[PDB]
Amino acid sequence: DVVVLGSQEGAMHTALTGATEIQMSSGNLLFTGHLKCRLRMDKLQLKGM
């Protein structure tokens, strides 16, 4: 006989522990992660001396 194994949503969440989560409703709203700038600053007064 046949048996549906049931929803594995809880087992899915227990699988994806240790992974960062993200809100994704409006296209994408991606979060936590880093990036690397090089910064050039000539072009700068001190808001008036």
Binding site: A11, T14, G18, A19, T20, H34
Partner: protein, 72 residues
């Protein structure tokens, strides 16, 4: 199922807490401690095996903590 391979040392970390926020580690440790507490006879058997094979003290302690951790 997806009960295991729980995406642990894959990398990909960040500054922020990931999913369970240091609860899965204590989950793992508490369930193996609970399973040791329920089944003392296998712990005694593992201790006897550790005393028999190896026989240098560090090897004994290593394989004893491993045979406590071999449970699925």
């Amino acid at each position: 199922s997806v009960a295991l391979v729980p995406h642990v040392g894959m990398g990909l970390e960040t500054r922020t807490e990931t999913w369970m926020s240091s609860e899965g580690a204590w989950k793992h440790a508490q369930r193996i401690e609970t399973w040791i507490l329920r089944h003392p006879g296998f712990t005694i058997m593992a201790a006897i095996l550790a005393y028999t094979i190896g026989t240098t003290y560090f090897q004994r302690v290593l394989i004893f903590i491993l045979l406590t951790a071999v449970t699925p």
